[PDB]
């Protein structure tokens, strides 16, 4: 094997759809959510009828080879992550890759970059991190650029994913490597990152 | 209705075996259309299959597990196990216990499902530090807008066990999610916009665990 | 060479399976001559076998719990796996892999053990131990027999390990019977048997370690003494 | 199932037997010790012979229902607990019912000690573990004169079932794990110990008072 793609949107109460692959061997093939990972959920009992004690907002339609999720009103809910899937053959099972959709049409969420400074406490950790924080980009996108002034750099690998926050508002972090010997040989690192085309400098002291 | 209560150990060493538990309510009938099921997901990535029990003591799984997998229930005693041979540290995931149904001749329902847990597995080689302070007792940010601690030194697995907001204000103190910091070995802490300088008008003190080596730790300068 | 361990968690609720691991070395999985066994040890007294794989690759185990009872070896790693499947709280005991060898024509005996390892059955789960320092203290020095150890509090379970200057100073250690909180947590005085006097001219450092969590620790104690 | 006596007594230097004597039908046999809990340690690896780690003290007998453990030169070890193993009854292994044996007339012995007040991390949680380590004594029976303020049976109590330790002479250390309430009240800790006969002293000054 199946395919899915990686993500789509419209606002609330609009329509919507989602692709899939499919078989017509395979025709009970059909889709799912799954919210963080959380207590999944199937949608249709094979590829276009809604089962018993399952609600309507949505259909999978007829469609064979390629599953086909349109949504009529968009909710809340549409936004957590979203399979297709089907019986294999002699006991096995057949699985997709999922989609974490988003609803845009939500109010958005800009700009929140920030930088946090360390403080000399940290260095007893090993550590002076830039506590380079990640908030409030619509979709979540950042891009790898990063300065010390003239220094040399160890940056390690720090740069999370856009991911999942309380009020909506895409976050993620880049909490920069900085070890007490490394600060010790480097000291003036800075949070140059472009969060959604903007960026923030302070660079740091303890 | 039907319910699917599903229960194992939390955490393991790399190099180990796994097992896992699953009991329902409502019937066990070896016959009728009804099966039972197993799936798995690393955190960061998709579901995935593993093996079914179908109506009669028909079972099956995907060839490309076979060596390392075996599957029996116990209905005389209420249970369900999945064994597992030889975790790979890529083995580490979220786990799920589930039922099937029959439709038409060789033609199934796949539709519901226990509450999952995650299969923990790590590397043993970790250590004992305690958690250190961010805090303002050095000039990290005015009292206005800080958090006093919740790093811990560094160690080869993630995670320390990082949390911020899940109260009623689920807006403006909204989250900063982190999951890693590669400081010559791996470490985390993450912080808040918040007021604080010390623990003498709310909990602002912040004290930790890391989770591949369990042992909750705390310090405090204010 | 021969060696052998039971690799393992360490507890377990009541209704759930218990499932376990162990290792070839210095030996071949093709021994006409030897083979392998896994044991239990009842809390503080008897000896109980389970169940043997042999290099014929036949099976074998007691009748008395035959349901309740597994073994395989997966040959992609040649390691031996022990499973039982629904425990009750009389199961917590030290179980043992171990190696069997044979004269022959059904003779056998076992030639080697593992260390064995403890497991204990409860609807409880574990505690995270509490440290601190043991040596004679600001009001005493003339002990009768001089120690110094990393005391422990509130643990549970029993597993944890302790010796003194970078663990290596292990002089007069052994295990004292293991204190007991009405909670279910446990604690622990163990020590090195080492001088009260020596330390204007020679001083010590405790190290410790957990188990149930790697927590690895050491501290100095140098000058812990004001006083007879 | 093999039936085995609770345990024999016979002293230093001197020698016995031991012997598994229930539904001996299997007929090569084998014979192990556990000591201090340790893992188990072999002696006999058919029912006359022995290999490198105890190759004269012990001996190894043939009956048909005694499978039978011949012990010489007695020594502080024998305090150990030993075991029968018959091969089964096809496919089939087995275990006897152990024995804890008990080597009398031995020295032992009245304690040597350290004694202390806790370090301050438990004053600092108004708890107040004052410790005798019980130790170094024999036989391993324990008779009580610690009755000074209490300081026998309080809070965390292990004046109970001593251990062996590598000195040989056994251990049996103890809490006062009470409240700060412990210096308000009790102030002398006189850890007086009897192993058959004899006794030996050691206190300290309470933390807070
Ligand atoms: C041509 O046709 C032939 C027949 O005409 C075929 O021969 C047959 O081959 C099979 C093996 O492929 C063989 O299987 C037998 O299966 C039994 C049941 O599974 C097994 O018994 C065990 O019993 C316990 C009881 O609790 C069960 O729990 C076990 O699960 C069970 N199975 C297993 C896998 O354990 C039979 O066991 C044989 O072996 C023991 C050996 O004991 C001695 O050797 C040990 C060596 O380590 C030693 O430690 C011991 O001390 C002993 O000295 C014997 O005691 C048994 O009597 C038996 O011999 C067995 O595996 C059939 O028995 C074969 N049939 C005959 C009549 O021999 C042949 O494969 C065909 N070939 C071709 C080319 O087509």
């Known amino acids: 094997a199946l395919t899915q793609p990686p993500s789509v949107s419209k606002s609330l109460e609009q329509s919507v759809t989602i692709s899939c692959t499919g078989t017509t061997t395979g025709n009970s093939v059909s889709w799912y959510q799954c919210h963080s990972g959380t207590a999944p959920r199937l949608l249709i009992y094979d590829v276009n009828k809604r089962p018993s004690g399952v609600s309507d907002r949505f259909s999978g339609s007829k469609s064979h080879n390629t599953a086909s999720l349109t949504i009529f009103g968009l909710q809340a809910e549409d936004e957590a992550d979203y399979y297709c899937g089907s019986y294999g053959s002699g006991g096995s099972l057949l699985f997709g890759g999922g989609t974490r959709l988003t609803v845009l049409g939500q109010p958005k969420a800009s700009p929140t970059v920030t930088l946090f400074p360390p403080s000399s406490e940290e260095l007893q950790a090993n550590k002076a991190t830039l506590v380079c924080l990640i908030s409030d980009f619509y979709p979540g996108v950042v891009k790898v650029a990063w300065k010390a002034d003239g220094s040399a750099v160890n940056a390690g690998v720090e740069t999370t994913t856009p991911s999942k926050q309380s009020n909506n508002k895409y976050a993620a972090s880049s909490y920069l490597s900085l070890t007490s010997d490394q600060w010790k040989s480097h000291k003036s690192y800075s949070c140059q990152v472009t969060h959604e085309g903007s960026t923030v400098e302070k660079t740091v002291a303890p | 209705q039907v319910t699917l209560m599903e229960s194992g150990p939390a955490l393991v060493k790399v190099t180990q075996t796994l097992a896992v538990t699953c009991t329902f309510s409502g019937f066990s009938i070896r016959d009728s259309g009804k099966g039972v099921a197993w799936i798995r997901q690393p955190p960061g990535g998709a579901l995935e299959w593993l093996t079914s029990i179908y109506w009669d003591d028909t079972k099956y799984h995907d060839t490309s597990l076979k060596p390392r997998l075996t599957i029996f229930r116990d209905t005389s005693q209420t249970q369900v196990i999945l064994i597992l041979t030889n975790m790979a540290p890529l083995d580490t995931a979220t786990?799920?216990?589930?039922?099937?149904?029959?439709?038409?001749?060789?033609?199934?329902?796949?539709?519901?499902?226990?509450?999952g847990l995650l299969v923990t597995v790590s590397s043993a080689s970790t250590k004992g530090p305690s958690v250190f302070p961010l805090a303002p007792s050095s000039r990290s940010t005015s009292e206005s807008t800080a958090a006093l601690g919740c790093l811990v030194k560094d160690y080869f697995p993630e995670p320390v066990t990082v949390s911020w907001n899940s109260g009623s204000l689920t807006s403006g103190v909204h989250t900063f999610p982190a999951v890693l910091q590669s400081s010559g070995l791996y470490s985390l802490s993450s912080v808040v916009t918040v007021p604080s300088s010390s623990l003498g008008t709310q909990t602002y003190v912040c004290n930790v665990n890391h989770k591949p080596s369990n042992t909750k730790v705390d310090k405090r300068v204010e | 060479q021969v060696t052998l361990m039971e690799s393992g968690p360490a507890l377990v609720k009541v209704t759930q399976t218990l499932a376990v691991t162990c290792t070839f070395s210095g030996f071949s999985i093709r021994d006409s001559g030897k083979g392998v066994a896994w044991i239990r040890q009842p809390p503080g007294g008897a000896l109980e076998w389970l169940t043997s794989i042999y290099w014929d690759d036949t099976k074998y185990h007691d009748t008395s719990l035959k349901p309740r009872l597994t073994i395989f070896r997966d040959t992609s790693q040649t390691q031996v796996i022990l499973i039982l499947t629904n425990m009750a709280p009389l199961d917590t005991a030290t179980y043992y892999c171990?190696?069997?060898?044979?004269?022959?024509?059904?003779?056998?005996?076992?030639?080697?053990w593992g260390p064995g390892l403890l497991v204990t059955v409860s609807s409880a789960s574990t505690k995270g131990p509490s440290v601190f320092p043991l040596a004679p203290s600001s009001r005493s020095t003339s002990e009768s027999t001089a120690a110094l150890g990393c005391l422990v509090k509130d643990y549970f379970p029993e597993p944890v390990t302790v010796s003194w200057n970078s663990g290596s100073l292990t002089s007069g250690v052994h295990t004292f019977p293991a204190v007991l909180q009405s909670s279910g947590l446990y604690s622990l005085s163990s020590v090195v048997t080492v001088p009260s006097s020596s330390l204007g001219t020679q001083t010590y450092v405790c190290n410790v370690n957990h188990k149930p969590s790697n927590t690895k620790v050491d501290k100095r104690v140098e000058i812990k003494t004001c006083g007879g | 199932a093999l039936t085995q006596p609770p345990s024999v007594s016979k002293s230093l230097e001197q020698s016995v037997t031991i012997s598994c004597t229930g539904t001996t039908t299997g007929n090569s046999v084998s014979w192990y010790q556990c000591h201090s809990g340790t893992a188990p340690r072999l002696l006999i690896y058919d029912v006359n012979k022995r290999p490198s780690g105890v190759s004269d003290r012990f001996s190894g007998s043939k009956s048909h229902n005694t499978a039978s453990l011949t012990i010489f030169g007695l020594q502080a070890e024998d305090e150990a607990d030993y075991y029968c193993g018959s091969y089964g009854s096809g496919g089939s292994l087995l275990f006897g019912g152990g024995t804890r044996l008990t080597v009398l007339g031995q020295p032992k012995a009245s304690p040597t000690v350290t004694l202390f007040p806790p370090s301050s991390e438990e004053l600092q949680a108004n708890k107040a573990t004052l410790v005798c380590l019980i130790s170094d004594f024999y036989p391993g029976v324990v008779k009580v004169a610690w009755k000074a303020d209490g300081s026998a049976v309080n809070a965390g109590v292990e004046t109970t079932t001593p251990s062996k330790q590598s000195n040989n002479k056994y251990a049996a250390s103890s809490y006062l794990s009470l409240t700060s309430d412990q210096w308000k009240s009790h102030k002398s800790y006189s850890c007086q110990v009897t192993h058959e006969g004899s006794t030996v002293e050691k206190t300290v000054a309470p933390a807070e008072c």
């Open positions: 171990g190696r069997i060898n044979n004269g022959g024509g059904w003779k056998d005996h076992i030639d080697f």
